[PDB]
Symmetry: none
Subunit: 76 residues, 3 copies
């Protein structure tokens, strides 16, 4: 009845970027407006919410590479 699991990934990989220069970036969005109305809010178990927002983002990561590697075993 003897069961053997040997698990040996060999990951010689690479993720790479070369950029000569990251240039001139302008983020100039106009004046946004947000309006939200209720009489009641009533939240129970494990709710998560964003109920009125205005979000301006410039990321410009300079080589934002990702090597996301979520991984698992399980048994019986």
């Amino acid at each position: 009845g003897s069961v053997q699991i040997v698990y040996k990934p060999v990951d010689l990989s690479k993720v790479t970027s070369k950029c000569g220069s990251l240039g001139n970036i302008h983020h100039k969005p106009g004046g946004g407006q947000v309006e939200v109305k209720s009489e009641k809010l009533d939240f129970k178990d494990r709710v998560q919410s964003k109920i009125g927002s205005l979000d301006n983002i410039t990321h410009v990561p300079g080589g934002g590479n990702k090597k996301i590697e979520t991984h698992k075993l399980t048994f019986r």
Copy 2:
């Protein structure tokens, strides 16, 4: 009945950037506006919430690389 589990991920990986210069960056959003209304808010178990916000962000990380590598085993 002998069970053997041998987990050994080898990983020689590289996540890499070369950037010659990070340039000229201008985060200039106009004047935003947010308005939010209720008579009542009523939050119970483990609620998490943002009711009204204005968020301006400039990240610009130079090297922005990620090697996220979440993992588990589990048994019986």
Copy 3:
């Protein structure tokens, strides 16, 4: 009835950046406005909340790389 669990990752991985200069960065958002109203707030177990905010952020980490690696066993 013998169980043997051997757990030996070999993570020789590297996360790397070269940036030749971090440039000129100008975070100049306009005058924001936020307004939030209620007649009652009522929060119970394990609530966490933000109810009116104006948040301006410049990060500029100059090689903000991440090697996040949450990792585990569990048993029986």
